[PDB]
Ligand SMILES: *CCC(=O)N(C)CCOc1c(N)ncnc1-c1cc(F)cc(NC(=O)c2ccc(C3CC3)cc2F)c1C
């Protein structure tokens with residue numbers, strides 16, 4: 447009935463880990479509904495800017511998005527209440543079950559993310575930090591996209607600056623690195639890297655390079671190799687995401703149609 451949640455309705459049960467804004471806890475809303483509670487660390491977020499734009503994020507609704515339930519702002523620290531995902535982040539899930547993953551399950555993961563991204567693209571809403579660490583897995587093995595657009599409110603120069611140690615260089619196209627030009631085509635690039643993370647079973651992209659060496663090699667035309675579990679058709683799809691020219695990259699609508707074609711073929 448309102449996006450402002452009463453913190454007295456929340457029960458804190460277990461710490462889930464730490465994100466870009468600090469501690470995130472698992473809990474219950476009104477003792478029944480499972481929730482993730484982000485406890486926004488002091489000085490980690492542009493809180494006023496986030497609160498002013500929160501309603502747009504609140505209205506984003508799709509089955510493949512980790513839902514934003516509401517906020518607790520009449521306090522300090524503020525809370526962000528989200529959908530809880532029982533299997534945690536995709537990156538750790540891939541690493542934990544690595545040699546038990548089948549190619550059909552890997553394709554299904556790509557499809558789930560692609561559907562979420564096709565929806566964000568239709569809303570002209572940028573994720574800005576799409577990667578396996580920012581995708582979550584529910585109890586049914588469904589992959590959902592998490593923390594879309596939250597990148598904009600980070601107060602941490604190491605993360606927001608392209609020359610910073612926490613900036614997601616390995617998921618960034620050249621126009622983001624050089625010109626800070628974010629678009630649905632920069633999310634396309636990150637999605638290609640994410641497909642590679644899925645098919646490589648959670649390997650770090652360009653592991654033999656530093657962040658600076660990655661940016662340099664990519665600018666010179668180097669691309670991620672075909673993972674062992676990726677077929678020629680799967681590699682063609684992820685590779686199409688890495689066109690040097692943003693306008694020559696496919697849309698998420700085109701990517702989804704290509705993923706469904708591979709699914710129907712196998
Ligand atoms: C990858 C490891 C892992 O499993 N983690 C971090 C736990 C996932 O836990 C979780 C669950 N199970 N459901 C919903 N939400 C979470 C969650 C927990 C956590 F500790 C951190 C986060 N992520 C963030 O808070 C986060 C990360 C990155 C960014 C970048 C600026 C965009 C923002 C942000 F809020 C989650 C989602």
Ligand code: NA
Nearest residue numbers: 673674675676
């Ligand atoms: Na192979």
